[PDB]
Coordinates of all heavy atoms in Angstrom, one line a residue:
Chain E
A173 N -21.8 4.6 9.7 CA -22.6 5.0 8.5 C -23.5 6.2 8.8 O -24.0 6.3 9.9 CB -23.4 3.9 8.0
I174 N -23.5 7.2 7.9 CA -24.4 8.3 7.9 C -25.5 8.1 6.9 O -25.1 8.0 5.7 CB -23.7 9.7 7.7 CG1 -22.8 10.0 8.9 CG2 -24.6 10.8 7.5 CD1 -21.8 11.1 8.7
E175 N -26.7 7.9 7.3 CA -27.8 7.7 6.4 C -28.2 9.0 5.8 O -28.2 10.0 6.5 CB -29.0 7.1 7.1 CG -28.7 5.7 7.8 CD -29.9 4.9 8.2 OE1 -31.0 5.4 8.3 OE2 -29.7 3.6 8.4
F176 N -28.6 9.1 4.5 CA -28.9 10.4 3.9 C -29.9 10.1 2.7 O -29.5 9.4 1.8 CB -27.6 11.0 3.4 CG -27.6 12.3 2.7 CD1 -27.3 13.5 3.4 CD2 -27.8 12.4 1.3 CE1 -27.2 14.7 2.7 CE2 -27.8 13.7 0.7 CZ -27.5 14.8 1.4
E177 N -31.1 10.7 2.7 CA -32.1 10.6 1.7 C -32.9 11.9 1.6 O -32.9 12.7 2.5 CB -33.1 9.4 2.1 CG -34.0 9.0 0.9 CD -35.1 8.1 1.4 OE1 -34.9 6.8 1.5 OE2 -36.2 8.6 1.7
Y178 N -33.5 12.1 0.4 CA -34.4 13.2 0.1 C -35.3 12.9 -1.0 O -35.0 12.1 -1.9 CB -33.5 14.5 -0.3 CG -32.8 14.4 -1.6 CD1 -33.4 14.9 -2.8 CD2 -31.5 13.9 -1.7 CE1 -32.7 14.9 -4.0 CE2 -30.8 13.9 -2.9 CZ -31.4 14.4 -4.0 OH -30.7 14.3 -5.2
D179 N -36.5 13.5 -1.0 CA -37.6 13.3 -2.0 C -38.0 11.8 -2.1 O -37.7 11.2 -3.2 CB -37.1 13.8 -3.3 CG -38.1 14.0 -4.4 OD1 -39.2 14.6 -4.1 OD2 -37.8 13.7 -5.6
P180 N -38.5 11.1 -1.1 CA -38.8 9.7 -1.2 C -39.8 9.3 -2.3 O -39.8 8.1 -2.6 CB -39.4 9.4 0.2 CG -39.8 10.7 0.8 CD -38.9 11.7 0.2
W181 N -40.6 10.2 -2.8 CA -41.5 10.1 -3.9 C -40.6 10.8 -4.9 O -40.1 11.9 -4.6 CB -42.7 11.0 -3.8 CG -43.5 10.6 -2.5 CD1 -43.5 11.3 -1.4 CD2 -44.4 9.5 -2.3 NE1 -44.3 10.7 -0.4 CE2 -44.8 9.5 -1.0 CE3 -44.7 8.4 -3.2 CZ2 -45.7 8.6 -0.5 CZ3 -45.6 7.4 -2.6 CH2 -46.0 7.5 -1.3
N182 N -40.2 10.2 -6.1 CA -39.2 10.9 -7.0 C -39.8 12.2 -7.7 O -39.5 12.3 -8.9 CB -38.5 9.9 -7.9 CG -37.2 10.5 -8.5 OD1 -36.6 11.5 -8.0 ND2 -36.7 9.9 -9.5
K183 N -40.4 13.1 -7.0 CA -41.0 14.4 -7.4 C -40.1 15.3 -8.2 O -40.5 15.9 -9.2 CB -41.7 15.1 -6.3 CG -42.9 14.4 -5.7 CD -43.6 15.2 -4.6 CE -43.2 14.9 -3.2 NZ -43.9 15.6 -2.2
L184 N -38.8 15.2 -7.9 CA -37.7 16.0 -8.5 C -37.2 15.4 -9.8 O -36.4 16.1 -10.5 CB -36.5 16.1 -7.5 CG -36.7 16.9 -6.2 CD1 -35.6 16.6 -5.2 CD2 -36.5 18.4 -6.5
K185 N -37.5 14.1 -10.1 CA -37.1 13.3 -11.3 C -35.6 13.2 -11.4 O -35.0 13.3 -12.5 CB -37.8 13.8 -12.6 CG -39.3 13.7 -12.7 CD -39.8 12.5 -13.5 CE -41.3 12.3 -13.3 NZ -41.6 11.8 -11.9
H186 N -34.9 13.1 -10.2 CA -33.5 13.0 -10.0 C -32.9 11.6 -10.3 O -31.7 11.4 -10.4 CB -33.1 13.4 -8.5 CG -32.9 14.9 -8.3 ND1 -32.2 15.4 -7.2 CD2 -33.3 16.0 -9.0 CE1 -32.2 16.7 -7.3 NE2 -32.9 17.1 -8.3
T187 N -33.8 10.5 -10.4 CA -33.6 9.1 -10.8 C -34.6 8.6 -11.8 O -35.8 9.0 -11.7 CB -33.7 8.2 -9.6 OG1 -33.0 8.8 -8.5 CG2 -33.1 6.8 -9.8
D188 N -34.1 7.8 -12.8 CA -35.0 7.2 -13.7 C -35.1 5.7 -13.3 O -34.1 5.0 -13.4 CB -34.5 7.3 -15.2 CG -35.5 7.1 -16.3 OD1 -36.5 6.3 -16.1 OD2 -35.4 7.7 -17.4
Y189 N -36.3 5.3 -12.6 CA -36.4 4.0 -12.1 C -36.4 2.9 -13.1 O -37.3 2.8 -13.9 CB -37.6 3.9 -11.1 CG -37.4 4.5 -9.8 CD1 -37.9 5.8 -9.4 CD2 -36.7 3.8 -8.8 CE1 -37.7 6.3 -8.1 CE2 -36.6 4.3 -7.5 CZ -37.0 5.5 -7.2 OH -36.9 6.1 -5.9
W190 N -35.4 2.0 -12.9 CA -35.2 0.8 -13.7 C -36.3 -0.1 -13.2 O -36.6 -0.3 -12.0 CB -33.9 0.1 -13.3 CG -33.5 -1.1 -14.1 CD1 -32.7 -1.2 -15.2 CD2 -34.0 -2.4 -13.9 NE1 -32.6 -2.5 -15.6 CE2 -33.4 -3.3 -14.8 CE3 -34.9 -3.0 -12.9 CZ2 -33.6 -4.7 -14.9 CZ3 -35.1 -4.4 -13.0 CH2 -34.5 -5.2 -14.0
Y191 N -37.0 -0.8 -14.2 CA -38.1 -1.7 -13.8 C -38.3 -2.8 -14.9 O -37.6 -2.8 -15.9 CB -39.4 -0.9 -13.6 CG -40.0 -0.3 -14.9 CD1 -41.1 -0.9 -15.5 CD2 -39.4 0.8 -15.5 CE1 -41.6 -0.4 -16.7 CE2 -39.9 1.3 -16.7 CZ -41.0 0.7 -17.3 OH -41.5 1.2 -18.5
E192 N -39.2 -3.7 -14.7 CA -39.6 -4.7 -15.6 C -41.1 -4.6 -16.0 O -41.4 -4.8 -17.2 CB -39.4 -6.1 -15.0 CG -37.9 -6.4 -14.7 CD -37.8 -7.3 -13.4 OE1 -38.1 -8.5 -13.5 OE2 -37.4 -6.7 -12.4
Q193 N -42.0 -4.2 -15.1 CA -43.4 -3.9 -15.4 C -43.9 -2.6 -14.8 O -44.5 -1.8 -15.5 CB -44.2 -5.1 -14.9 CG -44.6 -6.2 -16.0 CD -43.4 -7.1 -16.3 OE1 -42.7 -7.5 -15.4 NE2 -43.2 -7.4 -17.5
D194 N -43.7 -2.4 -13.5 CA -44.1 -1.2 -12.8 C -43.0 -0.8 -11.8 O -42.7 -1.6 -11.0 CB -45.4 -1.5 -12.1 CG -46.2 -0.2 -11.7 OD1 -45.5 0.8 -11.2 OD2 -47.4 -0.2 -11.8
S195 N -42.5 0.4 -12.0 CA -41.5 1.0 -11.1 C -42.1 1.2 -9.6 O -41.3 1.0 -8.7 CB -41.0 2.3 -11.6 OG -42.0 3.2 -11.8
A196 N -43.4 1.5 -9.5 CA -44.0 1.7 -8.2 C -44.1 0.4 -7.4 O -43.8 0.4 -6.3 CB -45.4 2.4 -8.4
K197 N -44.6 -0.7 -8.1 CA -44.7 -2.0 -7.5 C -43.3 -2.6 -7.2 O -43.1 -3.2 -6.1 CB -45.5 -2.9 -8.4 CG -46.9 -2.5 -8.7 CD -47.6 -3.5 -9.7 CE -48.8 -2.9 -10.4 NZ -48.7 -3.2 -11.9
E198 N -42.4 -2.5 -8.2 CA -41.0 -3.0 -8.1 C -40.1 -2.5 -7.1 O -39.2 -3.2 -6.6 CB -40.4 -3.1 -9.5 CG -40.9 -4.3 -10.3 CD -40.7 -4.3 -11.7 OE1 -39.5 -4.2 -12.1 OE2 -41.6 -4.3 -12.5
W199 N -40.1 -1.1 -6.9 CA -39.2 -0.4 -6.0 C -39.9 -0.2 -4.6 O -41.0 0.3 -4.5 CB -38.7 0.9 -6.6 CG -37.6 0.7 -7.6 CD1 -37.7 0.5 -8.9 CD2 -36.2 0.6 -7.3 NE1 -36.5 0.4 -9.5 CE2 -35.5 0.4 -8.5 CE3 -35.4 0.7 -6.1 CZ2 -34.1 0.3 -8.6 CZ3 -34.1 0.6 -6.2 CH2 -33.4 0.4 -7.4
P200 N -39.2 -0.6 -3.5 CA -39.8 -0.4 -2.2 C -39.9 1.0 -1.8 O -39.1 1.9 -2.1 CB -38.8 -1.1 -1.3 CG -38.0 -2.1 -2.2 CD -37.9 -1.3 -3.4
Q201 N -41.1 1.3 -1.1 CA -41.4 2.7 -0.7 C -40.5 3.0 0.5 O -40.3 2.2 1.4 CB -42.9 2.7 -0.2 CG -43.9 3.1 -1.3 CD -45.0 4.0 -0.7 OE1 -44.7 4.9 0.1 NE2 -46.2 3.8 -1.2
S202 N -40.0 4.2 0.6 CA -39.1 4.7 1.7 C -39.9 4.9 3.0 O -41.2 5.0 3.0 CB -38.4 6.0 1.3 OG -37.8 6.7 2.4
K203 N -39.2 4.9 4.2 CA -39.8 5.2 5.5 C -40.4 6.6 5.4 O -41.6 6.8 5.7 CB -38.8 5.1 6.6 CG -39.4 5.5 8.0 CD -38.4 6.1 9.0 CE -39.1 6.4 10.3 NZ -38.1 6.7 11.4

Side-chain angles (χ1 to χ4, degrees):
Chain E
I174 291 170
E175 300 197 341
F176 183 101
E177 197 192 271
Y178 69 93
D179 194 47
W181 305 101
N182 199 21
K183 294 186 262 181
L184 291 163
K185 298 257 168 287
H186 275 200
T187 314
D188 199 327
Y189 282 101
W190 183 103
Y191 72 103
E192 295 146 74
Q193 265 77 41
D194 199 317
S195 57
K197 300 179 201 132
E198 280 164 61
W199 282 91
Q201 267 221 40
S202 166
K203 174 210 185 167

